[PDB]
Design a protein around this ligand. Structure first.
Ligand SMILES: *[C@@H]1O[C@H](CO)[C@@H](O)[C@H](O)[C@H]1NC(C)=O
Ligand SMILES: *[C@@H]1O[C@H](CO)[C@@H](O)[C@H](O)[C@H]1NC(C)=O
Lengths: 41, 41
């Protein structure tokens, strides 16, 4: 389970399309299998 | 055929969604007819 938090304040939040951006894949990113966030669903 | 290249280095790459942005049309853009890139296809 992965959550988004602010840079200057710690508060775990659900991942949404309004706080993440689509980027070109890299080999360093995690390869999630289950419990994908709604941007990834 | 049009390819994308970096600003500080030269490498012809295919045009994807991740290296282009959708903008308001202008008269000084190229009006392509055939062999559209995948963002325009
Ligand atoms: C995810 O998979 C790709 C290709 O299968 C691999 O290159 C990448 O290292 C993987 N990411 C990991 C293991 O975090
Ligand atoms: C592209 O098409 C527009 C019409 O939508 C035109 O105004 C413009 O002059 C054209 N530019 C060219 C031919 O590159």
């Amino acid at each position: 389970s992965w959550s988004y938090t602010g840079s200057s304040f710690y508060q775990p939040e659900p991942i949404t399309t309004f706080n993440s951006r689509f980027v070109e894949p890299e080999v360093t990113f995690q390869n999630l299998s289950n419990n994908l966030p709604p941007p990834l669903l």
